[PDB]
Amino acid sequence: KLNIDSIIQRLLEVRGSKPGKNVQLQENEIRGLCLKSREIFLSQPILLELEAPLKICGDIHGQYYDLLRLFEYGGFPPESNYLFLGDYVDRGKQSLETICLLLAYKIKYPENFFLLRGNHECASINRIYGFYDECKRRYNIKLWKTFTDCFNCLPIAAIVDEKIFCCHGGLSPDLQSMEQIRRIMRPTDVPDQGLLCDLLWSDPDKDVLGWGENDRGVSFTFGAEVVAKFLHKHDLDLICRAHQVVEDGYEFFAKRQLVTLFSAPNYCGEFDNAGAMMSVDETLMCSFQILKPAE
Amino acid sequence: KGILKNKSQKWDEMNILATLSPEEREKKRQFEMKRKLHYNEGLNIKLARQLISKDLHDD
Known part of the structure; x- marks a missing residue:
């Protein structure tokens, strides 16, 4: 017994705040998230076959506030479907909030x-x-x-x-x-x-x-x-x-046959890049939603 | 309704638009150098492993 609606609620509570506000879940909740998600991953294929429409995101690297900006822009689950490409932890200040929210949403949807x-x-x-x-x-x-x-x-x-x-x-x-x-x-x-x-x-x-x-x-x-x-x-x-x-x-490569997506703007206080997320509609038409760098 | 299963892909040209130089060529080179320097994770794999090794041996 692990309360997913409560966990999501508390993680989302900091939505309006000044970037860097921590959410403190209990130890047993975090490992509850790990154990349940692990089960779901193992039960689904290692090579996912997915249907449009969906939003695709690149690296996030612990930038929790920026992850919340992404959902604001693309719609919080389940308003939209999401595929993230990895690199949720490290580099950033809030790896735990980032992974926990993502694992929580995986368990719920x-x-x-x-x-x-x-x-x-x-x-x-x-x-x-x-x-x-x-x-x-x-x-x-x-x-x-x-x-x-x-x-x-x-x-x-x-x-x-x-x-x-x-x-x-x-x-x-x-x-x-x-x-x-x-x-x-x-x-x-x-x-x-x-x-x-x-x-x-x-x-x-x-x-x-x-x-x-x-x-x-x-x-x-x-x-x-x-x-x-x-x-x-x-x-x-x-x-x-x-x-x-x-x-x-x-960024495109090879006459638009490959694209690189990176979703963390102002990457780890060392770059002043934009972040992007890709929208794929039912006909596979692709568009880009940008998080602009701080001014 | 789920999207896990187990037509042609196009670009929204108006979205792409809505999103060379000796100054811009310099700016690109600086970024590429920053990026090359930043991505050093390959250098510390062995050390990371030795750290995982000996912390296991603590038990």
Whole structure:
């Protein structure tokens, strides 16, 4: 017994406030959210097949106030359907509020609200880039361990009406068949190389022909023709991904066959970028809703 | 009504519009450099693991 309507209500209570106001849920509620969502993730496919209409969002990185701005703009659940591309924790000041609201909505609307796994939904990054420290400051290490187990079960990619492929990072040199994604067993950690690594780590690069070295020191870059071949082969129209801050919140690649979405404006007080969210209507017409940078 | 299952994609051209230089080329280069510097997570994977290792060994 875990009161979802209460949790959502308390998390949403800070809606008008000055950015940075904390919501303090009880320890047992947070791990209630983890345990129930984990169940739902495991019960749904690892490669989601989704119908339009829906809103797609990129990285959020603990920017809770900005997540609330996104829902204000796109409509709070269930007014709209949502697919998030990952990277909910780290970098920002309020990872816990962000993940809890998202996990709460997943539990309440399990077939209209969706979360993919980003590279920060992984202990090897989490320990170091804010989340663990958040957990240990406001609760304890044990809670971080619980989140790790939940994250290990997140789905990895989505296809929207057979036309739009969505994952956090991008393509893999090892991605030949969609069945290869379907075969990944959960729970699972992110390996240092291979398909699951690439899907969460790779980047598009204008200046690369085929597959190249990635400056991150993990995975690869891929060029425009690679994107073209993939869409052609699998009969798709668009690749939708996140993973890199861009100045205007979204950015096209390869004559509009790939788009990068990034939803956190003023990214971690180090950039002055816009954030964007993508709207996909029933006919698969796509439009962009921008959160402009602070003035 | 759910959207989990298990036509052509277009762009709203009016939405896209509604959303080169030696100054702008410089501004782009600065951003690309900032971004490259920021994305250093790959450098600390091993340390993160060693930290997870020894905190497990505390039990």
